[PDB]
Structure formats: C-alpha cells, structure tokens
Structure 1
C-alpha cells in the first residue's frame, strides 16, 4: 500500500472526492510556514500578485492551453437560461434525471497554473525595462486528474516566481533559483535529486513536444521519494519557455525582441506532504534545525 496513506488521518478530511480534501490545522500550519520560508527567499525588485482560483477562458485559450493539455482543463459552467428553464432542470433532478443538461460554458476556467494571468498583465505595461520583470505569484490551481494518492490532487496551491526578459535575464534567473531551491530543500531536511523532465502534453502531437522539451532541457524538476525511491514525486519545477509566451502576448524586451519567460514553481501541497512523510506528524519531534528554519 501507499506509504503516504497513513498521513491522511492527521492532515486531511474527506470531501467526498478523490484529490479534493479539507485541510486540518496541523497541515495548514506547515503550508503556511513553507510559504513564509519561500517568501523570505524572494529577490529584491519582485512584484507580488495573488490570483483567484479562476481566470479568463479567452486568456487561457490564447495561451495555447487547449493544444497542450485539453484533458486537464476545468471549465466553469452555469445555468444561464430563463427562470422557466432553470426550474425545469431542477425539477428533472427531483424526478431522478440530470439537471446538468441545462449548463452552458461561462467565460471562466479554473486556473491550471499560477503564471498564466501574469503575461497579459506584463504585456499591458509596454516594453520591458532593462533586466526585465520578476513576479511572485500564487493561486489555487486545478487539474482534472482524480487519484487517491495524497501527492496527486485535483485542487492544489501553486507558488511561482516568474521572470520575463531577454534570454540571458531568464536563463540566469532559472539558474539562480535552481541552486537556491536545492539549498532550501536541504535546509528542510528533504532527500531529493534534480532531473530534467517534460510536461504531460496530450496525444500523439504531445509526445513530440515532450521529446523536444526534454531534449532542450526546458524543464527541471526537484524530485522527492514519497511513494518510492524509484518513482519520486516532483515537488518543484524550473521552467524555460523561450519566447513562446512573449510572442503570444506581444511582450517586447528592452532590445525590441519578443521577450523570453521562465518560472520556478513550488507545489505547496506536495512540499507539505513531503515534510510530513519525511519528519512525521508530530512537529515537536521534527529536527531542531528544521524547526528553526521554519520559525517553529
């Protein structure tokens, strides 16, 4: 059985849906300390934005999310009909039928990653300054992948630092963060390795994108053994998008070329689970240095 399963009792309560859990005070206190630790490592000159759990469907479509991960997307739908129509849908439900046939799409989707809304915001400001722009973003994200594994959730918190600038601005940013993130993971007493990887692009066309991404080392992951040392869990990622989003959003660097972008992403729930898997569910029994690092 899954080594993580036994953690559930102290960390979560069931909400009647795989990958969607209520969080206990114990669990939340650690998510919060991890967030503050990440904040304490923020670089100077970084603009912090917090996003809600939904974003514009038009913006997500434009970002190319449908060509890449259509199977993971959560769209918002509602009952947009007349009073008569809505009442009938409710009455069908009372009579053993399906009220959801009266749903139609809203102009919103659940956010699949925290960075997406930042690109049009940056674009709206005109050409980037020399050195580019850096953002500290967070959102509750959603991916339609039900699982009973505690490290694979449908609704989860993502924290990211995003750099938008020249190729050199962005690649140096990513290298700074790859070193810094590993130092944080060591301070937290976590066991990990860093390997290159690829996003789960969908379909035949996706195997090619995944191959190129891996081959060009556009994505590193910090991997922590949770379920097994043979199938470790990615708890952070370090991503390089080249000019893909700079081109999509018409972002120009200080030299007048389409900007490059990259981000370092922290899976807050995976990291919290990793802390509890690694040091157990009694905080007073955590190593003193770990407690100190987290301000406990």
Structure 2
C-alpha cells in the first residue's frame, strides 16, 4: 500500500490491525489540525467532549443497528458472581476460554462523535430561533480491521453539529462545505468534494446508499492518497433531515420536528493525508502550511 512507508515515523504496532500507538511527531500534527479546526468554529457553538463509550440504549434508539450492526463495538464484561468469575479465570489459567462468561454491559464504543449530543439537546426543550450548534469530539470505534493506515478501528472524530429548521441546517452545511475546502486548500491538500453514501449493511443496505446518494444527503472531501481512483474521505457533510429530531422529540422554534446535520472531520485521516502530502520532516513543509498550522 502507498501509505505503508509512513508507519515507521507515525505509529507503533499494538498487535492488532487498525489499532496503533501514536508517536510524538504524529500527535503534534493531530493537535495542530485540531487547533486549526477550532479556530474556524462558528460563534454560539457549544463545545462538548465525549468519552470513547456511550449508552447502548441511546445508540439502539438512534437506529444504528438498522444501518451498521456489523461495525458496532459493544462493551462486555464479567458481570457474574465471585464464584463464576473465579471459574472463568481458572479456565483461562488452563489455556481454556474465559470469554464465555462475558455478557454485554449497557455501553457501546461510540461509532461517531455526534450520537450522544441529540438526547442532550432534547432535554433542554424546544429550540431557540436559529437552532443550536455543537462542537463535539470523541475517540470512535468501527469494527473494520484493515492494515491500511487510513482505515482504522479506533480513530478520532471531530464534528460540528447543527440542530434546527431545514433552513438552519441547509445554510450550516453550505457554509461548512465552502469553509472545509478553504481549509484543505490552505493545508496544501489535493481534493474534491463529491456526493457519497454511508456503507449501510446488507442487500437492503446497498439500496439505502443509492437513495442517500440520489438525495444528496452526504458529501465527502476526498483526498487521493493511495490512488486518484480510490481517494480517501477525510471529511463528510451529512444531512439527516428530521431523523434525529423525530427520534428524540426535538422541536424547532416553529413547533416542528427539528432537522439535523453535521460536518465531520476524520482527524487521523487528515493527519495521515498531511504526512503523505508533505512528508515526515516538518521543517521542510511549505511555509504557508507551517504558518496556518502555527508551526
């Protein structure tokens, strides 16, 4: 793979595909990218930071199982008695299988940063005029093992989320599609923005994706890393219509089920994109790129 050469300076193996330790070099660029994204945050945007786990009940209610059940990471634990747990450990000691004593907790690993924000927004009552905007971030998980450096299981996601009328969300997405491209341009990245679809599971899934594409509910900023025919999506721009509004009983200022949308930044994909484009030697990065990153 064309990205493979970056591994030595950016990552250390943690004995599992798609799960890597991050070097100081790598993390310094993730941090600078995070700071750059923050500097573009719209006024009146509330910042929340989510842990890498969230309520399994909230995720189920959001309809995640209808869409990507194959990607979900669930938290499980030894929830039994001292006696049963001791027996699980004994099995392990004999080289047997302790994992049969596992049962699901009430938590999942969060598959996107925005999911926990909707119930939080709902609890505040009806939306003000102009809606609400959130700046959210989480370490996310997706059960898709791969050796490609742009396809991780554990990765950092940053999102700006808009909740309001169709117009509020539409205007928000349009601002951010322009703004995202300006950012990528100042970062010296090559890209295009194109219609896209989420990888819905199953036969029925395939068709949901076709319809999503036709309705243009999802755009991606695609950067050609390994090839120009197989570019990597490093940002997405998502319109959910009233799905979360209806699910969580969120009402806009005109008493209608709120619409929602988000702009998502894949922090690890953007950092890998930067190192691939500009190399691992930061002193040699282009002057304007070093400038806009505060290097």
Q: Do the structures match in fold with TM over 0.5? A: yes
Quick one: distance in 1 between partners of 2:144 and 2:97? Answer: 23
Quick one: distance in 1 between partners of 2:212 and 2:123? Answer: 29
Superposition deviation, residue 154 in structure 1: 0.1
- More deviation, 90-99/283-292: 90-99
Structure 1: runs of 5+ lacking an equivalent: none
The C-alpha deviation readout for 1:95-121, integer Å capped at 9, x for no partner, is: 121100000000000000000000000
Quick one: distance in 2 between partners of 1:230 and 1:280? Answer: 22
Q: What secondary structure, in the 3-state scheme, does the structure 2 residue paired with 1:252 have?
A: coil
Task: Kindly report which structure 2 residues correspond to 1:1-296, keeping only aligned pairs within 5 A, or say none.
Answer: 2-296=1-295
The C-alpha deviation readout for 1:60-109, integer Å capped at 9, x for no partner, is: 00000001000000000000011111111111111121100000000000
Q: What secondary structure, in the 3-state scheme, does the structure 2 residue paired with 1:256 have?
A: coil
The C-alpha deviation readout for 1:255-280, integer Å capped at 9, x for no partner, is: 00000000000000000000000000
Superposition deviation, residue 295 in structure 1: 0.1
Quick one: distance in 1 between partners of 2:204 and 2:57? Answer: 23
Give structure 1 regions of 4+ aligned residues with deviation exceeding 3 angstroms: none
Q: What secondary structure, in the 3-state scheme, does the structure 2 residue paired with 1:284 have?
A: helix
- More deviation, 258-267/84-93: 84-93
Quick one: distance in 2 between partners of 1:109 and 1:219? Answer: 25
Superposition deviation, residue 209 in structure 1: 1.1
Quick one: distance in 2 between partners of 1:116 and 1:105? Answer: 20
Quick one: distance in 1 between partners of 2:120 and 2:204? Answer: 30
The C-alpha deviation readout for 1:209-229, integer Å capped at 9, x for no partner, is: 111100000000000011111
Give the alignment's TM-score, normalised by structure 2. Answer: 1.00
The C-alpha deviation readout for 1:144-170, integer Å capped at 9, x for no partner, is: 000000000000000000000000000
Superposition deviation, residue 192 in structure 1: 0.3
Structure 2: runs of 5+ lacking an equivalent: none
Aligned residues: 295
Superposition deviation, residue 204 in structure 1: 1.5
Q: CA RMSD in A?
A: 0.4
